[PDB]
């Protein structure tokens, strides 16, 4: 399969064009539209890469076009660890789907934040806030595919099955790629020597949800998460031999481009995925 990567949360990690030109990733999730819902004006946060006021982040459409011409899929990730995002009602789900359509996908807005490129879909990295209406947000975004171009739906649930924020949304069957985060969660992640908490968790997910492909989400360096790091040699010798048997295996997802560069994790595992 391929490597999905999160880009956008450290200004020293290189441009989106530098990231796609690496030829290591097949999917890039742009990290974070971290404020929306509840009448808030939506705001994208891309750390030190650019300030979105007055179209500062509009240069990012160059990197999106570059990645797409190389067949890389590019999603805008909603959520993240830090932010006031929430949906207050089903009406709010409609209003947010609307904004996302016109500002990031095929609708139209004078003020598109990342510029004129049309992203491939929306990633759900919902970690806190309401557990409600995310299934409605996924339905309203799917319905836009009926106006000709396909909107991809991905989700990054953390590994406790079911995810309290994303379980109802995952049960619709509308998601294309699900990259389960097997880190910062001791009961389902790797701890030295023990591979059975992560494999056993992998089994609950690949047999329970109705989705296109499931990926093994990992931290790219011991510094990228509080816990959950797996050394390259353990991943390749002990975990991937078992999870690649699954027909739903899609590949591996890595939290952050930034850490991946410092640690050379992709460079170590790219042919085994």
Ligand X SMILES: CC(=O)N[C@@H]1[C@@H](O)[C@H](O[C@@H]2O[C@H](CO)[C@@H](O[C@@H]3O[C@H](CO)[C@@H](O)[C@H](O)[C@H]3NC(C)=O)[C@H](O)[C@H]2NC(C)=O)[C@@H](CO)O[C@H]1O
Q: According to the binding rule CB under 6 A, does residue 10 interact with ligand X? A: yes
The binder of ligand X chosen from 2, 37, 52, 83 (CB under 6 A): 83
Query: Is the Cβ of residue 83 or residue 250 nearer to ligand X in the bound state?
Result: 83
Per DSSP, helices labelled H in the chain are 16-20, 60-69, 90-104, 134-143, 167-170, 196-208, 232-234, 240-243, 257-263, 265-269
Active site residue 127: yes
Q: Kindly determine how many residues on this chain lie close enough to bind ligand X according to the rule CB under 6 A.
A: 15
Using rule CB under 6 A, residue 59 touches ligand X: no
Contact pick of 23, 48, 143, 194 for ligand X (by CB under 6 A):
48
Of residues 9 and 206, the one with the C-beta less far from ligand X: 9
Among the listed ranges 58-66, 76-84, 107-115, 199-207, the one in contact with ligand X (CB under 6 A) is 76-84
Q: Which is nearer to ligand X, 238 or 262 (CB)?
A: 262
- Distance in angstroms (rounded) separating the CA atoms of residues 2 and 117: 23
Instruction: Please give the C-alpha separations between residue 22 and each of 29, 77, 97, in angstroms, as whole numbers.
Output: 15, 21, 32
Binding residue for ligand X, selected from 2, 80, 121, 228, defined by CB under 6 A: 80
Q: Distance between alpha carbon 66 and the CA centroid of its chain, in Å?
A: 19
Binder among 26, 34, 86, 154 for ligand X (CB under 6 A): 34
DSSP 34: E
How do strand 43-44 and strand 25-35 relate by DSSP bridges?
Answer: antiparallel
CA distance 193 to 133: 39
Catalytic residue among 13, 127, 223, 242: 127
Task: Please give the positions annotated as active site.
Answer: 127
């Amino acid at each position: 399969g391929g490597i999905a990567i999160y880009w956008g949360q450290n200004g020293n990690e290189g441009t989106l064009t530098q990231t796609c030109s690496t030829r290591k990733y097949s999917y890039v999730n742009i990290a974070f539209l971290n404020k929306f819902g509840n009448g808030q004006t939506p705001q994208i946060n891309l750390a030190g890469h650019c300030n979105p006021a007055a179209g500062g982040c509009t240069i990012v459409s160059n990197g999106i076009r570059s990645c797409q011409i190389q067949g890389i899929k590019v999603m805008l990730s909603l959520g993240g660890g830090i932010g006031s995002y929430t949906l207050a009602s089903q009406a709010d789900a409609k209003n947010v789907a609307d904004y996302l359509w016109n500002n990031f996908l095929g609708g139209k807005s004078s003020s598109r934040p990342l510029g004129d490129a049309v992203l491939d879909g929306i990633d759900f990295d919902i970690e806190h806030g309401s557990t409600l209406y995310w299934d409605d947000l996924a339905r309203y975004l799917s319905a836009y595919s009926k106006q000709g171009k396909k909107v991809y739906l991905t989700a990054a649930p953390q590994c406790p099955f079911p995810d309290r924020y994303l379980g109802t949304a995952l049960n619709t069957g509308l998601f294309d790629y699900v990259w389960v985060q097997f880190y910062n969660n001791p009961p389902c992640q790797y701890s030295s020597g023990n591979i059975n908490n992560i494999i056993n968790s992998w089994n609950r997910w690949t047999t329970s949800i109705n989705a296109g492909k499931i990926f093994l989400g990992l931290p790219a360096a011991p510094e990228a998460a509080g816990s959950g790091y797996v050394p390259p040699d353990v991943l390749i010798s002990r975990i991937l031999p078992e999870i690649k048997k699954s027909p739903k295996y899609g590949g591996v997802m890595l939290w952050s481009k930034f850490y991946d560069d410092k640690n050379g994790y992709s460079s170590s595992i790219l042919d085994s995925v």
